[PDB]
Every structure is written in structure tokens, then in C-alpha cells.
Amino acid sequence: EKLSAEAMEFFCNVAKLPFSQQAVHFLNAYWAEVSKEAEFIYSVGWETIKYADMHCKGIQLVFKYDEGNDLDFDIALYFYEQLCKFCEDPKNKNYATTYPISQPQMLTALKRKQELREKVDVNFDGRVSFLEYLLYQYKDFANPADFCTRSMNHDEHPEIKKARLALEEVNKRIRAYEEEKARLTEESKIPGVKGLGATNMLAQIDSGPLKEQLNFALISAEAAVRTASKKYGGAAYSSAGAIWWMNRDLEEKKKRYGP
Amino acid sequence: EKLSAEAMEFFCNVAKLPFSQQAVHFLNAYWAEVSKEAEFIYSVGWETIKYADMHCKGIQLVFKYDEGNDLDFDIALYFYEQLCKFCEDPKNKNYATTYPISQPQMLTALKRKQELREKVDVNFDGRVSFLEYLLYQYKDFANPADFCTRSMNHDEHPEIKKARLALEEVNKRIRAYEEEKARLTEESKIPGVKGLGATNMLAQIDSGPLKEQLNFALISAEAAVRTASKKYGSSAGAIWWMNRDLEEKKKRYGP
Amino acid sequence: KLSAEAMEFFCNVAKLPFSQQAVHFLNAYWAEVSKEAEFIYSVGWETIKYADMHCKGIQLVFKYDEGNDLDFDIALYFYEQLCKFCEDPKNKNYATTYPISQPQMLTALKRKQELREKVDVNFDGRVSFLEYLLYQYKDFANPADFCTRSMNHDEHPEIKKARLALEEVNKRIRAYEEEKARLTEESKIPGVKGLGATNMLAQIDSGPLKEQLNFALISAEAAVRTASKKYGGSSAGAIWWMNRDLEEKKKRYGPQKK
Ligand SMILES: [Ca+2]
Ligand SMILES: [Ca+2]
Ligand SMILES: [Ca+2]
Structure with a gap:
């Protein structure tokens, strides 16, 4: 056809x-x-x-x-x-x-x-x-x-769009966090002064700002996914695929970057 | 070779x-x-x-x-x-x-x-x-x-170039017109007031300025093509092509 | 992998x-x-x-x-x-x-x-x-x-200087060849205007585009000598490549008469 x-x-x-x-x-x-x-x-x-x-x-x-x-x-x-x-x-x-x-x-x-x-x-x-x-x-x-x-x-419902974009904002915070990690890593290999500041930062990175922002972005995503799922995912909480994908993706994210 | x-x-x-x-x-x-x-x-x-x-x-x-x-x-x-x-x-x-x-x-x-x-x-x-x-x-x-x-x-004669470009001006006015008709047609399927207003507008589309400008472009192209056709009708492919193009546009969008 | x-x-x-x-x-x-x-x-x-x-x-x-x-x-x-x-x-x-x-x-x-x-x-x-x-x-x-x-x-700076100096030669080549082609085309023109283009084309090697290309070539030659004397790490490829490319440029745009 x-x-x-x-x-x-x-x-x-x-x-x-x-x-x-x-x-x-x-x-x-x-x-x-x-x-x-x-x-x-x-x-x-x-x-x-x-x-x-x-x-x-x-x-x-x-x-x-x-x-x-x-x-x-x-x-x-x-x-x-x-x-x-x-x-x-x-x-x-x-x-x-x-x-x-x-x-x-x-x-x-x-x-x-x-x-x-x-x-x-x-x-x-x-x-x-x-x-x-x-x-x-x-x-x-x-x-x-x-x-x-x-x-x-x-059309994508707005609660769903919100939740998708909240998930995309987790990606953005993940990039920011991993880029800084990698920045510091590559400076880590600068002997001296330094070189040495990089190491401590790298060591401390998960109590730093960028990790903090990621942690909070994960909470926002989760809240947004929940309200979308409650509204459109039937009991257990057409849009079913979007509901399943966003939960799956949230799950993956939390596993990898959550507490 | x-x-x-x-x-x-x-x-x-x-x-x-x-x-x-x-x-x-x-x-x-x-x-x-x-x-x-x-x-x-x-x-x-x-x-x-x-x-x-x-x-x-x-x-x-x-x-x-x-x-x-x-x-x-x-x-x-x-x-x-x-x-x-x-x-x-x-x-x-x-x-x-x-x-x-x-x-x-x-x-x-x-x-x-x-x-x-x-x-x-x-x-x-x-x-x-x-x-x-x-x-x-x-x-x-x-x-x-x-x-x-x-x-x-x-080299393309200047009269022929002018006709070719006047035909492309028609295309531009076709695009503006059809784009408005499609936007109205889209809007037309919205439930209630807005859909009705767009259905009404679509009925008026051919009185509108977009259509007027297309009709104007068609007339200018026709002039330009006849000027070129009279003079050169070596250039025979161009004259055939622009008449053919013009005839098609007139049939679709002329009176 | x-x-x-x-x-x-x-x-x-x-x-x-x-x-x-x-x-x-x-x-x-x-x-x-x-x-x-x-x-x-x-x-x-x-x-x-x-x-x-x-x-x-x-x-x-x-x-x-x-x-x-x-x-x-x-x-x-x-x-x-x-x-x-x-x-x-x-x-x-x-x-x-x-x-x-x-x-x-x-x-x-x-x-x-x-x-x-x-x-x-x-x-x-x-x-x-x-x-x-x-x-x-x-x-x-x-x-x-x-x-x-x-x-x-790593590419040592004297070598990069040389590479870039050779690319500068390429830019002067382009300017020169573009004017040679432009005059070539102009010299088609049947009247006295072809004659003027014809003559400018014939004289072009004593003109300033070619002069500028000559300067670039000579500057590339100094820059390449400097690099090569120091490292001729290892930068053996780079040293071979710049000299070879210089030689090419000299053969086509250096002194031509024997
Ligand atoms: Ca495809
Ligand atoms: Ca081809
Ligand atoms: Ca490849």
C-alpha cells in the first residue's frame, strides 16, 4: 500500500x-x-x-x-x-x-x-x-x-512531553558531569602544579556541583514520569509505549547515576 | 571524446x-x-x-x-x-x-x-x-x-532568461498560494469555531491577494515568454520548454 | 579493536x-x-x-x-x-x-x-x-x-612553521594561476583587448603576483632548512615530506631557464 x-x-x-x-x-x-x-x-x-x-x-x-x-x-x-x-x-x-x-x-x-x-x-x-x-x-x-x-x-500529551524533556535534561546533566570528569582526568596526567588539583577534584567529584545538579535532575525526571504515568498508564499507576519507554529509561538512568 | x-x-x-x-x-x-x-x-x-x-x-x-x-x-x-x-x-x-x-x-x-x-x-x-x-x-x-x-x-539570450525567471516568479506565487490553502485546510479540521472560520476563508481564497498576485505573475510570464518566442522561434529547446511550462501553469492556475 | x-x-x-x-x-x-x-x-x-x-x-x-x-x-x-x-x-x-x-x-x-x-x-x-x-x-x-x-x-614548532610556510606557497600559487587563467581567457578576445591580455599574460612572470609567490617560496625554503637542520621525534616523515614538497614547488615555480 x-x-x-x-x-x-x-x-x-x-x-x-x-x-x-x-x-x-x-x-x-x-x-x-x-x-x-x-x-x-x-x-x-x-x-x-x-x-x-x-x-x-x-x-x-x-x-x-x-x-x-x-x-x-x-x-x-x-x-x-x-x-x-x-x-x-x-x-x-x-x-x-x-x-x-x-x-x-x-x-x-x-x-x-x-x-x-x-x-x-x-x-x-x-x-x-x-x-x-x-x-x-x-x-x-x-x-x-x-x-x-x-x-x-x-499528539503527544503535555504531561508526557514534560516527562520526556525532563529525561532529556538528565542527559544534559550527565554530559556536563562526564565532561568535567574527563576534563579533570586528562589534567590529572599533568605532573605538578597542577596537575594535582585535578586529582583531588576528580576524587571529590561526586560531592561537587555537577553531580549535585544531576542528582536533582534525576528527581525531577522521576516526578515528571510518575505524574505522566499516573495520568495515562492505567492501573499499575495509546500512550502505553511512551509510558513504558520513559520508565525504562528512568530506571536505566537511576541505576547508572543515582545514589 | x-x-x-x-x-x-x-x-x-x-x-x-x-x-x-x-x-x-x-x-x-x-x-x-x-x-x-x-x-x-x-x-x-x-x-x-x-x-x-x-x-x-x-x-x-x-x-x-x-x-x-x-x-x-x-x-x-x-x-x-x-x-x-x-x-x-x-x-x-x-x-x-x-x-x-x-x-x-x-x-x-x-x-x-x-x-x-x-x-x-x-x-x-x-x-x-x-x-x-x-x-x-x-x-x-x-x-x-x-x-x-x-x-x-x-549564452542564454537575455529575453529568454527574463522569461525563465518570470516563470520561476510564477512558481514562487504558486508556493505562497498553495501554502496558504494548505494552512487553512489544516486549520479547517480543528473542532468548533476555528475550523469553521478556516473553512469559510478557504471558500474566499481565490478572491484573495495571494491569488491576485499569482494571476499577476501569470500575465507577466506570458508577456515575457511571447516576447522571447516571437524573437527566437539553437534556442528552440528553450522556447519549446518555456511555452510548455507556461501552458501547464495557465491550465492549472489560469481562468 | x-x-x-x-x-x-x-x-x-x-x-x-x-x-x-x-x-x-x-x-x-x-x-x-x-x-x-x-x-x-x-x-x-x-x-x-x-x-x-x-x-x-x-x-x-x-x-x-x-x-x-x-x-x-x-x-x-x-x-x-x-x-x-x-x-x-x-x-x-x-x-x-x-x-x-x-x-x-x-x-x-x-x-x-x-x-x-x-x-x-x-x-x-x-x-x-x-x-x-x-x-x-x-x-x-x-x-x-x-x-x-x-x-x-608531537609536531615540533619549527616543523609546523615549515608546513604552514609551504601552505602559504599554495595560496600564492592559487592567486598566480588564477590570474594566468583569467588573462588566458581574456586573450581570447579578438580585438586589441585580446592583444593587451595576450601581452599581460606573456609578461606575467615579472609581475607582482609571481613576485609574491617567489617570496613565499624562498621563505618556505628558509623555514624548511631550519626544521630539517634541527631534526633531520623522529619527524623523519615530516622532514622528508616538506623537502619533497618544496622541491616540487621549486621545480614548477622556481627558476625555469637552464
Ligand atoms: Ca528512508
Ligand atoms: Ca556525475
Ligand atoms: Ca573510515
């Missing part, structure tokens, strides 16, 4: 959003069908497309990465290859047995580009978005026209 | 112009040989390259498209494939039957890219312009060096 | 202009590769510039701002041109004098596969001169080893 101009414009806009927002559009639309793969989408699909994008952009450290949206076909190829390698590694056999419908398919380079071109790249821009990867991965029930029908005219 | 550095400089400059200018240069140069294919070039070739470019740039509506110049090999492949698809479609039989020498050829993807590397991509930039498509499609009688021979030192 | 610190260094080096990539690689591997330096300069670096130039729509070398890396399609052009150059009978002496610098012909498919599997070390879809070098000379060079060898080498 070719898309109307109106649906294509929608699709193209979603597909230029940061990957995580593409993911949430997908998850909201298909929550009834796909909720049990959410964890794979989050932990494996997202991480992998992000790493492929980082390399493309010559970024090594996650805290310096501004999240991307789509990949050219050569970079997509590295994405799908990395997916297959991850899932084929016995160290991750849990992911493979627990999420069969999420498993990628190994293909030669040639067959891969032919699938991108024939099937995955639905707006014909020579780019692969996370959205496009998702739709094709879950094609037993998902497809672009269906997706647009499901997702069009469902 | 291999371009001199001077011919190559020219060739590169023409391939950076918007596709439609690429088209005119090629048509002026080869009018004797190619004039009867002009409708295909305009209605199938050009339309298809513009849509390929459009998609690459994330544009769906022709009034929001700023005209491009070349495509990478992945987009080029979509372009050539869409040509084949269109021309093999029974509903387009008449383009296939009437314009046999303009028909594309089906290739696999590896065969295609290899053709783009070996034959089509004459300046080795990794891109396919409309000029490069055209030159190879009609290789029976055209080629790069002969094209540069035929095309260099034939 | 590089560490984060190494990979960052590598990516930074690979975004420098091709000639600085070259110097990085040559400074690092001078022991093992010294004898191929002329092939890297006159064949590898020329061919990669030209592929880059074409990609950017530039036809004349004096109009080109040096790049840093190529997409896979342009890399393919680069490798095919290397092979073509090396297979031309007129260039048999490059083939024979520099056998370890020799490229291998591949089909397009196989080329792109090798770019992807072997050459494109930082997985960015681009081929840098550094990447081409590391893989061509992989018998003794690899990315980790390179970073190990290079991260601890």
Missing part, C-alpha cells in the same frame, strides 16, 4: 525525529501487538542503531552523542550486521530465545542492500530510520500505511 | 544547474535530432528525476520543492527503476509506443550501478545529473564532447 | 587533510616504509586528491582545498585509478621500483566488500588516506600499532 501524500509527510516527519521518539511512535501504535518485544527494541535495537550512527559521526563516548535519525545504506549495513552478530553470540542467547519475532536475518551485503531498497526504505530517500527498521522487522503485523493510520492525529 | 579540462569545467557547471536548465541546454544542443522526444523528456524524464530528488529530500508536494541538480547512485537507481516501471505500465502504453527512442532499459541493481560508474557518471563525481541521464539515453547521437562543442559559447 | 582514546585519536588524524595523514603515517612507519615515500607522495596522494577533487567538482589542482576522506563510491574510483595508473606501460618504473605499494585490481563488489570488511576501520562509511595506507602496508602496519606509534609524537 503506497501512502497518500498526507501519510507520507507524517511518516517522513516521524522518521526524522530522534531514534527514541521514532521508537515511541512505533510502540504507542503497536503496543497491543508488540509490547513483549519492547525490551529488545530498547536494549538491542536502539543501542545498536545508536552505535552505528555514532561511528558514522566519529563519536566514541555516549555522553557526547546527540541522538540521530537515519542511516545511509552503507551505515545501515553495519547496523544490521552488528544486530546479527549480537543476537548470534551465545552470551546473548537469552535475547534470542526470549524474543524470536525480533530476531534479525543474516544476509550478504548484496542481498541486504537489495532488501533496503525493495522493502525497508519506504520513503525512497536512500536512508534507513529506526522507524523503517521496526516496521520491516515486525512486518507480520506492522506496515507503513497501517502505522500512519494508527499514529496520525495522536 | 575525453573532455578537455575546459570542456569538463563547462560540463560540470551545466550539471550543477537545476535539472530543467540541464534539459534546456541538452534540448538546444540537440534539437535537430531530439525535438520529437521533448514531450517525453519533459513529462516523463524530468518529472521522474524531480520526484526521485524530492523523495531524497523528504518533499512530497511539488510547490514546496526547490529544484535539484543531481542524485547519488542509490537515488539514481530509484530514478531509473521508476522510469522502467512507468514505461512498462499498461496505462502508459502511449508514452512507450510514441517515444520508443526515449525508453529506458531494465537492469538489475549491480548492472545499473556498474553502468552508472562506467558510462553515465562522466565527471566521476559519484552523482547522476539529468544531463548525464539524457546524454547516455540518447547516445545514438549525443555524447559529452559533442555536447560541449554544441553547447559552449551559446 | 582500538580503545576509546585510540579510536578518538585515529578519527581525528583521519579528518586532517590527506597530506597530514600521510605525514602521520610516515613519521610512524619510517623504518619500514621510507623507500615507498615517493610513491606515496607522487602516486597515492595525487590519486586520492584527484578523486576528491572530482567528487567536489574541481578540475584544477590550484583551485582545490585539500580533503580528508571519500565515500565508498568515490573510494572505488580512487582504487581503480591507482590500478589504472600502475598498469599503464608509461609508468612501469613506478610499478617496479615500488612493489609493496602496488594496488590490486578488484571487481566493484569485491572492492566494496574489502572497504567494508578491512579498510574502513572506524566504521564511518568513508575511506581516509590513513586508512588506505594502513591497509596497503598491512604487512607491517595496523591501526592499533599506528596509534601506539603516533599518539606520543
Whole structure:
């Protein structure tokens, strides 16, 4: 089913959003069908497309990465290859047995580009978005026209937007904190005077301002996620994917940078 | 056959112009040989390259498209494939039957890219312009060096330039008008007062100043095109192209 | 597989202009590769510039701002041109004098596969001169080893002075060649105006653009002598590269009459 101009414009806009927002559009639309793969989408699909994008952009450290949206076909190829390698590694056999419908398919380079071109790249821009990867991965029930029908005219609720942006503000505080850590680290290797101030600062860093600001940003995020979840996540507390993603992400953040 | 550095400089400059200018240069140069294919070039070739470019740039509506110049090999492949698809479609039989020498050829993807590397991509930039498509499609009688021979030192006449620019002024007024109609149309689906007010405004759109300015632009373009057509009708590709462009605009947006 | 610190260094080096990539690689591997330096300069670096130039729509070398890396399609052009150059009978002496610098012909498919599997070390879809070098000379060079060898080498200021002095020569070359081409074009004009352009073109070497280029050349020559006398660490690549480049500039823009 070719898309109307109106649906294509929608699709193209979603597909230029940061990957995580593409993911949430997908998850909201298909929550009834796909909720049990959410964890794979989050932990494996997202991480992998992000790493492929980082390399493309010559970024090594996650805290310096501004999240991307789509990949050219050569970079997509590295994405799908990395997916297959991850899932084929016995160290991750849990992911493979627990999420069969999420498993990628190994293909030669040639067959891969032919699938991108024939099937995955639905707006014909020579780019692969996370959205496009998702739709094709879950094609037993998902497809672009269906997706647009499901997702069009469902605007992000303001409580949800607040909570998403509060989470993005945690990212900003994490970057500020990790950049300063790394600043100090690299001065740490200045023998003398100093050189030496750097060391104590580094040693003291988690009682410093930037760590303080991160700790408080984590509380704000959490409060905002809660009020959004209470309002839209049903008991336990359409927007279900956004609710699940934000809680997952908060969880990850707290684990890594909380008390 | 291999371009001199001077011919190559020219060739590169023409391939950076918007596709439609690429088209005119090629048509002026080869009018004797190619004039009867002009409708295909305009209605199938050009339309298809513009849509390929459009998609690459994330544009769906022709009034929001700023005209491009070349495509990478992945987009080029979509372009050539869409040509084949269109021309093999029974509903387009008449383009296939009437314009046999303009028909594309089906290739696999590896065969295609290899053709783009070996034959089509004459300046080795990794891109396919409309000029490069055209030159190879009609290789029976055209080629790069002969094209540069035929095309260099034939400056666009000022009267023709003026008409071309007056036609682009129409495009600008089309865009302003369609952009307002779309904004109103959007607004129109808001529940209650606001939606109703925008539905009313849409009914008035053709009395409005945007439309007035489009009608004005159309009249000026028509004047400019007739001035140029009377004088020059070597320049035959440009005259054909601007009349064709003008006729289409008048049909869509004239009385 | 590089560490984060190494990979960052590598990516930074690979975004420098091709000639600085070259110097990085040559400074690092001078022991093992010294004898191929002329092939890297006159064949590898020329061919990669030209592929880059074409990609950017530039036809004349004096109009080109040096790049840093190529997409896979342009890399393919680069490798095919290397092979073509090396297979031309007129260039048999490059083939024979520099056998370890020799490229291998591949089909397009196989080329792109090798770019992807072997050459494109930082997985960015681009081929840098550094990447081409590391893989061509992989018998003794690899990315980790390179970073190990290079991260601890700094460009001494007298050497940077020299590099920059040579780039100043490039800017004066451009100004001169642009005026030569402008007069050349002007001398087309059939009347007495072609005659005036024709004469200015004929006299151009006694003009001030050429004078300014002569000064730049001489200043680069002092700056290069200073660097070379002090360090000729080790900065063996850099010292070789500046002198070689100076020699080239002298041959084309220095005294011409014998
Ligand atoms: Ca796409
Ligand atoms: Ca080209
Ligand atoms: Ca690379």
C-alpha cells in the first residue's frame, strides 16, 4: 500500500525525529501487538542503531552523542550486521530465545542492500530510520500505511512531553558531569602544579556541583514520569509505549547515576 | 571524446544547474535530432528525476520543492527503476509506443550501478545529473564532447532568461498560494469555531491577494515568454520548454 | 579493536587533510616504509586528491582545498585509478621500483566488500588516506600499532612553521594561476583587448603576483632548512615530506631557464 501524500509527510516527519521518539511512535501504535518485544527494541535495537550512527559521526563516548535519525545504506549495513552478530553470540542467547519475532536475518551485503531498497526504505530517500527498521522487522503485523493510520492525529500529551524533556535534561546533566570528569582526568596526567588539583577534584567529584545538579535532575525526571504515568498508564499507576519507554529509561538512568 | 579540462569545467557547471536548465541546454544542443522526444523528456524524464530528488529530500508536494541538480547512485537507481516501471505500465502504453527512442532499459541493481560508474557518471563525481541521464539515453547521437562543442559559447539570450525567471516568479506565487490553502485546510479540521472560520476563508481564497498576485505573475510570464518566442522561434529547446511550462501553469492556475 | 582514546585519536588524524595523514603515517612507519615515500607522495596522494577533487567538482589542482576522506563510491574510483595508473606501460618504473605499494585490481563488489570488511576501520562509511595506507602496508602496519606509534609524537614548532610556510606557497600559487587563467581567457578576445591580455599574460612572470609567490617560496625554503637542520621525534616523515614538497614547488615555480 503506497501512502497518500498526507501519510507520507507524517511518516517522513516521524522518521526524522530522534531514534527514541521514532521508537515511541512505533510502540504507542503497536503496543497491543508488540509490547513483549519492547525490551529488545530498547536494549538491542536502539543501542545498536545508536552505535552505528555514532561511528558514522566519529563519536566514541555516549555522553557526547546527540541522538540521530537515519542511516545511509552503507551505515545501515553495519547496523544490521552488528544486530546479527549480537543476537548470534551465545552470551546473548537469552535475547534470542526470549524474543524470536525480533530476531534479525543474516544476509550478504548484496542481498541486504537489495532488501533496503525493495522493502525497508519506504520513503525512497536512500536512508534507513529506526522507524523503517521496526516496521520491516515486525512486518507480520506492522506496515507503513497501517502505522500512519494508527499514529496520525495522536499528539503527544503535555504531561508526557514534560516527562520526556525532563529525561532529556538528565542527559544534559550527565554530559556536563562526564565532561568535567574527563576534563579533570586528562589534567590529572599533568605532573605538578597542577596537575594535582585535578586529582583531588576528580576524587571529590561526586560531592561537587555537577553531580549535585544531576542528582536533582534525576528527581525531577522521576516526578515528571510518575505524574505522566499516573495520568495515562492505567492501573499499575495509546500512550502505553511512551509510558513504558520513559520508565525504562528512568530506571536505566537511576541505576547508572543515582545514589 | 575525453573532455578537455575546459570542456569538463563547462560540463560540470551545466550539471550543477537545476535539472530543467540541464534539459534546456541538452534540448538546444540537440534539437535537430531530439525535438520529437521533448514531450517525453519533459513529462516523463524530468518529472521522474524531480520526484526521485524530492523523495531524497523528504518533499512530497511539488510547490514546496526547490529544484535539484543531481542524485547519488542509490537515488539514481530509484530514478531509473521508476522510469522502467512507468514505461512498462499498461496505462502508459502511449508514452512507450510514441517515444520508443526515449525508453529506458531494465537492469538489475549491480548492472545499473556498474553502468552508472562506467558510462553515465562522466565527471566521476559519484552523482547522476539529468544531463548525464539524457546524454547516455540518447547516445545514438549525443555524447559529452559533442555536447560541449554544441553547447559552449551559446549564452542564454537575455529575453529568454527574463522569461525563465518570470516563470520561476510564477512558481514562487504558486508556493505562497498553495501554502496558504494548505494552512487553512489544516486549520479547517480543528473542532468548533476555528475550523469553521478556516473553512469559510478557504471558500474566499481565490478572491484573495495571494491569488491576485499569482494571476499577476501569470500575465507577466506570458508577456515575457511571447516576447522571447516571437524573437527566437539553437534556442528552440528553450522556447519549446518555456511555452510548455507556461501552458501547464495557465491550465492549472489560469481562468 | 582500538580503545576509546585510540579510536578518538585515529578519527581525528583521519579528518586532517590527506597530506597530514600521510605525514602521520610516515613519521610512524619510517623504518619500514621510507623507500615507498615517493610513491606515496607522487602516486597515492595525487590519486586520492584527484578523486576528491572530482567528487567536489574541481578540475584544477590550484583551485582545490585539500580533503580528508571519500565515500565508498568515490573510494572505488580512487582504487581503480591507482590500478589504472600502475598498469599503464608509461609508468612501469613506478610499478617496479615500488612493489609493496602496488594496488590490486578488484571487481566493484569485491572492492566494496574489502572497504567494508578491512579498510574502513572506524566504521564511518568513508575511506581516509590513513586508512588506505594502513591497509596497503598491512604487512607491517595496523591501526592499533599506528596509534601506539603516533599518539606520543608531537609536531615540533619549527616543523609546523615549515608546513604552514609551504601552505602559504599554495595560496600564492592559487592567486598566480588564477590570474594566468583569467588573462588566458581574456586573450581570447579578438580585438586589441585580446592583444593587451595576450601581452599581460606573456609578461606575467615579472609581475607582482609571481613576485609574491617567489617570496613565499624562498621563505618556505628558509623555514624548511631550519626544521630539517634541527631534526633531520623522529619527524623523519615530516622532514622528508616538506623537502619533497618544496622541491616540487621549486621545480614548477622556481627558476625555469637552464
Ligand atoms: Ca528512508
Ligand atoms: Ca556525475
Ligand atoms: Ca573510515
